[PDB]
């Protein structure tokens, strides 16, 4: 299928693109395309953020209107199906380089040299405790801003990424 | 720029009968990507802004009854009102709004209703004493709720047929009973108003067995 | 062409079961959209020349006489999803992330 | 829900620039649409699309009247402005402020604003009562109304008993006289059984002259 | 870059163990060359963001709290080998067959 | 690496190629290339079959000579490493479309329509016995001549492929 | 192991075609090589590559003598043929049948075959004994030999006691005389203590005339 | 066609001393694909076919001792025999055999050995009585195992220096002791042979304190 959405970019100068327009995003014959818009409410004075295409997503299924369902968040977001369905939108809540030490690199003084970053982490397992350090490239760091690999869960495992030389050592 | 041409200009069909209008476009309105036609059908009643009836050629809008339907393809489209009603009397416009910039409208096709004859109720109003203090005489004759629209009004002062001194005004078809109203005004000079006695309005219409005449006399309570 | 199963159908053949991921449940407020998305997961057994994406699987199964490492159910097709989030300096980022949703399950 | 309000001057001298502002209600301009549109309807003719503009600034003047029109927006004032240079009497018309859509066509419209092009100064209306025919058949029907004479330019809006009496109301189109002034008659039919019972007031509003009159019509005794 | 193990090294991490296939042992005389070739096989466990070829693996592991279907060790790279054999009508065929030898092992 | 071998094709007329020559076969930077030759002995009168390139193979490792090690087979084969090492060779043995029924296609009368072939097979398992029928395309049939999927092992499982309509039914 | 045998005419008339066949042993021609080669060595000069040919038929004549040479193979007879048209005396030389290789260069060679271009008929050799110096010092050394006079063309192969006596053997190059005939001398040194003990036979072979002589050399008494 | 030029023509070094030969090519012999040089070094002893010593510029062949080594690159190559031996006396040829068709040879560089002086052992042989029946006289003089190669032979019959009636033949350097042999033949007419009495051969060489003379008399057992 083929889908044309309204495209808008607020950070269009730094990113060097058109401020507003309409784009056509070719899709996959196996999945479906959507349109999306994002804006800040802030006391009735609406400021645009980003409009455009939005690949398949289970939440935008069967929605001809772009209505933010979130319960009063900072940045409002909505999506919809069909050509140009992001032309309008409203808010209606729902009622429902560097070098480090990698613990499996003893071949070279337990070291590395990735362009991305390096991590260290562990938890209580195999009885007592463990220890893990490693380094991963820039590509594997996804998303760009906040690589998940650098995130943890409060309840057990901790995690930390870092960029400086040899920062992934001991807790 | 996708010229628009509706057809016909006027249309007169009886209550509960089918009405159909056709508009042609010079360029194809079909869109290849999503296989759709960017055409719109609008209704406009007197004094009101146009109201969108149909978009996407055949898709109806929320709150629009079922008697309205759109159809067609490419460069020929049709709009059918099944079982016309008196509230559906209006002018109708065919528009195209595809992505191409120039959005153009049709010529406007009025829909009219066919109805049983109706003789007008005829009244007359002498000039109010308030405007008879500023050198003005306004003698009014009102024909009300009649059909067909063809009607004649002859003014007569002291049995003198007036000519070129009267102005007529007519309303559009009623949305409750499909009739017409007509107001005629004789603009006379206060001086001439005092100079004469009997003022009369004579109406002639199909529904009248004989020309009707409503008259009064200058200054008789 | 892989087979897409659901909680309803039962048996243990390499198949795509549904599984929804929810970032909000993790506590990740820096993700604006999607607060929750469709991930899915593969489950089942791989036996007797079934959805063998590569001949090596069948040849290493007939290679062995109920040895240890039989074939397992791994996803065989990935698709991307979009994301609207904040980055380190709290700049708004719209990105396309591949390798998030599985589309088929297969054997190797 | 959304409401499109519009407003203009009403009268314009010949061969001068014209302007119209279109306020918005129940919906932020940056939201609830991508395009916005100006249309006009000559006196008794069809429709003609003047132009449209996205809330980002880009405009698409109709090629028919291009190079004389100027159209802009203001998201801080929730507004939307139209400008039309070197006007002629052909430009006299009712201008509509609508929202152009790329899925539903122009779906919502405004209440319209009448703009006349004439080198004649404004005038206020005179309101006279057309007293009910003192000979009425006390069981049948009695007709009454009020006349609005000598105003310029269009429009005058008439209502009866503050919109509380609307059944059997006929307001005619304004007639133009030799002196370039407008006359108009509003009439109503009522049961003669209430002539000395129900009061009947006609409310004329001529905004171009800020003239609001509420005139009562009463019979005359013998 | 996957890790290539051998019978010597031990532990259960997703790794490429050696495994030689022999057609003659099956009794397939119609194969002229190779009478026996190098196939290899993957074995091991997949835990804690190890050789995750796709983010979906880590996200579906943190998705769950020791649920059932963890990641498994599947081959992640295939290479072809040549063959000189007889066909149905006993005509000599020289062919290149992809998907016969595994080059890396990974997790999903 | 890059490798140039002596190329020879006996069935060069039907296959429409050069009878003899030298070819250069670009390789993969991760693996190694070989050369190979194949001939029929038949009482001292040597007849060529096929010479050319031979992708990585654990048997041709570290062999500058092309020597058939097989123990008196019908068709002699040898390979070697290094450019042109198939220029010579000797023998020295070693001292060491259609439609069928697929059992999981009940959606369409338990049927299919592959361009390749269809199979049926089973063995004693899950206690008693089973039954499996299926159809697979022309691509998955590998090698061209003898698709393995159509082969079995005498000891338990049997196998049969077939081309005719509805031939993969009952044992 | 492999052995490259060669054979030719030996003598060739001027301005006529020449031919040479090269049999093979201990290795099938289609096997144990891709190329095969013909080289020649003029009388006392260097080497010159005549040509090569793959067992599939394709030939590569040396650009120097191209358009006069013809070279072919025969895998059914394990053979390998060379042909050279319009011969001159410059073409007189020792032709070598070798195997050209694309890894080891020409690794194996043949025993060579001498080809002469002359408009003179063949002749057989005469073998004369150079009796040992009857004055020998009965403790020192005695020299003897045999002379091969008046043969044509080259070569004659000399051996002593059937290759059983080779220490102290000197066979000189053949000298060419006024009559266009060849002379050659073979000599050997021996202990004088065996003059009446060990027998000494020189074996001359001139194949172009099928002349094999085994001549015994003996002293002369006083 | 990759012209070949060896250097020098002759080479004379003493036993156990180092010998080095250099050949230049007009075109580069290096091959870019496998980073190799298709050059060959061959040895040829008298009467034997050439024998390949080195291939691939610096790779030695099975059964070839270590004293032989090849080196060089591009268009300049060298072959060194460390510690020459008398069996290694021969001619040596530099060849190129890259894939390009024309395979060319060098000019041929002979290797010679330097040795202590050696006076020849001189013998003479009168004509056999078997050839003295066919009108032929062949008087032979043999110089054996001498060094250097420069040697002089004067024939004398009845004390008459012969001239233009004798033919000399010389062997190549010995592979056991590095010396030379020489055979001179006087081809005389049977009639003239009967006409004279004393036949003598006079040798002059560096290793001789005085010219040596071996003679005999016609018909004296
Ligand atoms: C923004 O917030 C106001 C109330 O806070 C709400 O009425 C409106 O619908 C929201 N969304 C808009 C204006 O797009
Ligand atoms: C073919 O067979 C013969 C004996 O049967 C053997 O000597 C020879 O080496 C074999 N291979 C060849 C000729 O290439």
Short mmCIF file of N, CA and C in Angstrom, two decimals, chain E residues 20 23-24 26 28 30-38 79-97 100-101 103-104, chain F residues 11 14-15 23 28 30-31 36-38 40 49-50 52-59 70 73-77 94 142-148 151-152:
data_model
loop_
_atom_site.label_atom_id
_atom_site.label_comp_id
_atom_site.label_asym_id
_atom_site.label_seq_id
_atom_site.Cartn_x
_atom_site.Cartn_y
_atom_site.Cartn_z
N UNK E 20 31.04 -32.98 11.86
CA UNK E 20 31.30 -33.39 10.49
C UNK E 20 30.18 -34.31 10.01
N UNK E 23 28.21 -38.40 4.15
CA UNK E 23 27.15 -38.98 3.33
C UNK E 23 27.36 -40.48 3.14
N UNK E 24 28.61 -40.90 2.94
CA UNK E 24 28.89 -42.32 2.75
C UNK E 24 28.35 -43.14 3.91
N UNK E 26 25.71 -42.60 5.48
CA UNK E 26 24.29 -42.78 5.20
C UNK E 26 24.05 -43.82 4.11
N UNK E 28 24.92 -43.03 0.64
CA UNK E 28 24.55 -42.26 -0.54
C UNK E 28 25.73 -42.30 -1.51
N UNK E 30 25.58 -41.94 -4.74
CA UNK E 30 25.41 -41.03 -5.86
C UNK E 30 26.15 -39.71 -5.67
N UNK E 31 26.73 -39.47 -4.49
CA UNK E 31 27.51 -38.27 -4.23
C UNK E 31 28.98 -38.62 -4.45
N UNK E 32 29.62 -37.93 -5.38
CA UNK E 32 31.03 -38.19 -5.69
C UNK E 32 31.94 -37.36 -4.80
N UNK E 33 31.64 -36.07 -4.64
CA UNK E 33 32.44 -35.21 -3.80
C UNK E 33 31.53 -34.13 -3.21
N UNK E 34 31.64 -33.84 -1.90
CA UNK E 34 32.50 -34.49 -0.91
C UNK E 34 31.86 -35.71 -0.27
N UNK E 35 32.61 -36.82 -0.20
CA UNK E 35 32.13 -37.98 0.55
C UNK E 35 31.84 -37.63 2.00
N UNK E 36 32.45 -36.57 2.52
CA UNK E 36 32.25 -36.12 3.89
C UNK E 36 32.70 -34.67 3.97
N UNK E 37 31.94 -33.85 4.69
CA UNK E 37 32.23 -32.42 4.74
C UNK E 37 31.93 -31.87 6.13
N UNK E 38 32.22 -30.58 6.29
CA UNK E 38 32.22 -29.91 7.58
C UNK E 38 30.92 -29.14 7.74
N UNK E 79 26.98 -20.52 4.57
CA UNK E 79 27.88 -20.47 3.43
C UNK E 79 27.65 -21.69 2.56
N UNK E 80 27.90 -21.58 1.26
CA UNK E 80 27.63 -22.70 0.35
C UNK E 80 28.82 -23.66 0.24
N UNK E 81 28.54 -24.82 -0.35
CA UNK E 81 29.58 -25.78 -0.69
C UNK E 81 29.26 -26.38 -2.05
N UNK E 82 30.29 -26.85 -2.74
CA UNK E 82 30.11 -27.41 -4.06
C UNK E 82 29.86 -28.92 -3.98
N UNK E 83 29.29 -29.45 -5.05
CA UNK E 83 28.92 -30.86 -5.12
C UNK E 83 29.05 -31.35 -6.55
N UNK E 84 29.59 -32.56 -6.69
CA UNK E 84 29.70 -33.25 -7.97
C UNK E 84 28.97 -34.57 -7.82
N UNK E 85 27.83 -34.71 -8.51
CA UNK E 85 26.97 -35.86 -8.26
C UNK E 85 26.30 -36.31 -9.55
N UNK E 86 25.54 -37.40 -9.44
CA UNK E 86 24.65 -37.87 -10.49
C UNK E 86 23.23 -37.39 -10.21
N UNK E 87 22.48 -37.12 -11.27
CA UNK E 87 21.08 -36.74 -11.13
C UNK E 87 20.19 -37.93 -11.51
N UNK E 88 18.91 -37.66 -11.75
CA UNK E 88 17.95 -38.75 -11.97
C UNK E 88 18.36 -39.60 -13.17
N UNK E 89 18.51 -38.97 -14.33
CA UNK E 89 18.92 -39.68 -15.54
C UNK E 89 20.40 -40.03 -15.55
N UNK E 90 21.09 -39.87 -14.42
CA UNK E 90 22.51 -40.22 -14.29
C UNK E 90 23.38 -39.32 -15.16
N UNK E 91 23.07 -38.03 -15.19
CA UNK E 91 23.91 -37.03 -15.82
C UNK E 91 24.76 -36.34 -14.75
N UNK E 92 26.00 -36.03 -15.10
CA UNK E 92 26.93 -35.45 -14.13
C UNK E 92 26.55 -34.00 -13.88
N UNK E 93 26.43 -33.62 -12.61
CA UNK E 93 26.03 -32.28 -12.22
C UNK E 93 27.05 -31.72 -11.25
N UNK E 94 27.54 -30.51 -11.55
CA UNK E 94 28.36 -29.71 -10.65
C UNK E 94 27.50 -28.55 -10.16
N UNK E 95 27.30 -28.47 -8.84
CA UNK E 95 26.40 -27.50 -8.28
C UNK E 95 26.99 -26.82 -7.06
N UNK E 96 26.43 -25.65 -6.76
CA UNK E 96 26.76 -24.88 -5.56
C UNK E 96 25.51 -24.82 -4.69
N UNK E 97 25.60 -25.36 -3.49
CA UNK E 97 24.45 -25.48 -2.59
C UNK E 97 24.68 -24.53 -1.42
N UNK E 100 24.51 -24.85 4.06
CA UNK E 100 25.00 -26.17 4.45
C UNK E 100 25.93 -26.11 5.65
N UNK E 101 26.77 -25.08 5.76
CA UNK E 101 27.70 -24.93 6.86
C UNK E 101 27.35 -23.65 7.62
N UNK E 103 28.44 -20.58 10.10
CA UNK E 103 29.65 -19.80 10.33
C UNK E 103 29.65 -19.08 11.67
N UNK E 104 28.48 -18.76 12.22
CA UNK E 104 28.37 -18.13 13.52
C UNK E 104 27.13 -18.67 14.22
N UNK F 11 30.35 -31.93 -20.58
CA UNK F 11 29.03 -31.65 -21.14
C UNK F 11 28.92 -30.17 -21.50
N UNK F 14 25.76 -29.34 -24.58
CA UNK F 14 24.42 -29.19 -24.02
C UNK F 14 24.33 -27.97 -23.12
N UNK F 15 25.33 -27.77 -22.26
CA UNK F 15 25.36 -26.63 -21.36
C UNK F 15 25.83 -25.35 -22.04
N UNK F 23 39.66 -20.25 -15.50
CA UNK F 23 38.69 -19.33 -14.92
C UNK F 23 39.25 -18.73 -13.64
N UNK F 28 35.33 -15.22 -0.91
CA UNK F 28 34.92 -14.48 0.27
C UNK F 28 36.14 -14.18 1.13
N UNK F 30 36.33 -14.15 4.12
CA UNK F 30 36.28 -14.92 5.36
C UNK F 30 36.66 -16.38 5.18
N UNK F 31 36.64 -16.90 3.95
CA UNK F 31 36.93 -18.31 3.71
C UNK F 31 38.01 -18.48 2.65
N UNK F 36 39.58 -28.11 -8.38
CA UNK F 36 39.17 -29.50 -8.41
C UNK F 36 39.17 -30.03 -9.84
N UNK F 37 39.33 -31.35 -9.95
CA UNK F 37 39.27 -32.06 -11.22
C UNK F 37 38.62 -33.42 -11.01
N UNK F 38 37.99 -33.92 -12.07
CA UNK F 38 37.27 -35.19 -12.02
C UNK F 38 37.37 -35.86 -13.38
N UNK F 40 37.53 -40.15 -15.42
CA UNK F 40 37.27 -41.58 -15.37
C UNK F 40 38.51 -42.34 -15.81
N UNK F 49 36.29 -35.22 -17.14
CA UNK F 49 34.90 -34.91 -16.82
C UNK F 49 34.79 -33.42 -16.55
N UNK F 50 35.28 -32.97 -15.39
CA UNK F 50 35.09 -31.57 -15.03
C UNK F 50 36.28 -31.05 -14.23
N UNK F 52 37.69 -27.20 -12.46
CA UNK F 52 37.33 -25.82 -12.18
C UNK F 52 37.54 -25.46 -10.72
N UNK F 53 36.80 -24.44 -10.30
CA UNK F 53 36.89 -23.95 -8.93
C UNK F 53 36.05 -24.81 -8.00
N UNK F 54 36.43 -24.81 -6.72
CA UNK F 54 35.76 -25.61 -5.71
C UNK F 54 35.80 -24.83 -4.41
N UNK F 55 34.64 -24.40 -3.93
CA UNK F 55 34.56 -23.54 -2.75
C UNK F 55 35.15 -24.24 -1.54
N UNK F 56 35.20 -23.54 -0.41
CA UNK F 56 35.84 -24.08 0.79
C UNK F 56 35.34 -25.48 1.09
N UNK F 57 36.26 -26.35 1.49
CA UNK F 57 35.94 -27.73 1.82
C UNK F 57 37.04 -28.26 2.72
N UNK F 58 36.65 -28.90 3.82
CA UNK F 58 37.61 -29.34 4.81
C UNK F 58 38.55 -30.43 4.31
N UNK F 59 38.26 -31.04 3.16
CA UNK F 59 39.08 -32.15 2.68
C UNK F 59 40.26 -31.71 1.83
N UNK F 70 40.39 -41.85 -3.10
CA UNK F 70 39.35 -42.87 -3.02
C UNK F 70 39.91 -44.25 -3.37
N UNK F 73 37.05 -46.03 -7.07
CA UNK F 73 35.64 -45.75 -7.38
C UNK F 73 35.37 -45.70 -8.87
N UNK F 74 34.11 -45.47 -9.25
CA UNK F 74 33.78 -45.35 -10.67
C UNK F 74 34.38 -44.08 -11.26
N UNK F 75 34.09 -42.93 -10.66
CA UNK F 75 34.55 -41.64 -11.14
C UNK F 75 35.55 -41.09 -10.14
N UNK F 76 36.77 -40.83 -10.61
CA UNK F 76 37.83 -40.29 -9.77
C UNK F 76 37.67 -38.78 -9.62
N UNK F 77 37.93 -38.30 -8.41
CA UNK F 77 37.82 -36.89 -8.06
C UNK F 77 39.02 -36.49 -7.22
N UNK F 94 44.46 -43.90 -0.32
CA UNK F 94 44.87 -43.59 1.04
C UNK F 94 44.88 -44.86 1.89
N UNK F 142 16.60 -29.37 -3.42
CA UNK F 142 18.05 -29.24 -3.55
C UNK F 142 18.72 -30.52 -3.08
N UNK F 143 19.73 -31.04 -3.80
CA UNK F 143 20.23 -30.54 -5.08
C UNK F 143 19.24 -30.72 -6.22
N UNK F 144 19.49 -30.05 -7.34
CA UNK F 144 18.60 -30.12 -8.49
C UNK F 144 18.21 -31.57 -8.80
N UNK F 145 19.20 -32.40 -9.10
CA UNK F 145 18.95 -33.78 -9.47
C UNK F 145 18.23 -34.58 -8.41
N UNK F 146 18.87 -34.76 -7.24
CA UNK F 146 18.36 -35.60 -6.17
C UNK F 146 18.06 -34.76 -4.94
N UNK F 147 16.86 -34.18 -4.84
CA UNK F 147 16.47 -33.49 -3.59
C UNK F 147 16.49 -34.44 -2.40
N UNK F 148 17.31 -34.11 -1.40
CA UNK F 148 17.43 -34.96 -0.22
C UNK F 148 16.07 -35.19 0.43
N UNK F 151 14.66 -38.40 0.16
CA UNK F 151 15.45 -39.54 0.60
C UNK F 151 15.14 -39.86 2.05
N UNK F 152 15.39 -41.11 2.43
CA UNK F 152 15.05 -41.59 3.76
C UNK F 152 16.22 -42.41 4.32
#
